[PDB]
Design a protein around this ligand. Structure first.
Ligand SMILES: [Cl-]
Lengths: 92, 8, 91
């Protein structure tokens, strides 16, 4: 139920977004976590095959984001470069 | 132009 | 025929894909609209049963997307409320 996704920043867009977070509009009802919210079919995330929309983001390059605010997590993700390592949690 | 498809 | 479909984001998100949009390679000839292109076998859209591949997306939570760019429709679907109201058109 836990998966790591590794994404290299390149010429090709990463093709995903995250939503949610403490103090933000929940991405899903009753859960303030950070989740993968979209995946573009021509981006790195889709090409990697390791990310799925709705996956909960637990950490970004080793940094726990299970209680992060949205903007803090977005700031962490843009400072995760050239490589992004995500720890993901997925339901059945 | 590019074909755009997105999972949501 | 026009149908309203209502979906709450869950473990697979909304659990479908959209294709098309103004300025993009069209999903259907000469028609740059937003269409439901896939439905995931798990997830909210699949459990609801109210979406069909090939459905034209006319509006998302009241916002007309008949002439929208793809990223605008993606934002409507993922950056607003977790509950999504879709107006869909079928041939
Ligand atoms: Cl039309």
């Amino acid at each position: 139920s836990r998966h790591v996704a590794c994404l290299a920043r390149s010429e090709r867009g990463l093709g995903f977004s995250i939503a949610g977070g403490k103090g933000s509009t929940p991405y899903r009802a009753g859960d303030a976590g950070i989740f993968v919210s979209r995946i573009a079919e021509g981006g790195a995330a889709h090409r990697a095959g390791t990310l799925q929309v709705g996956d909960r983001v637990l950490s970004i390059n080793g940094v726990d984001v299970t209680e992060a605010r949205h903007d803090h997590a977005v700031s962490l993700l843009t400072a995760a470069s050239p490589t992004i390592a995500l720890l993901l949690e997925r339901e059945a | 132009k590019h074909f755009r498809e997105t999972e949501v």
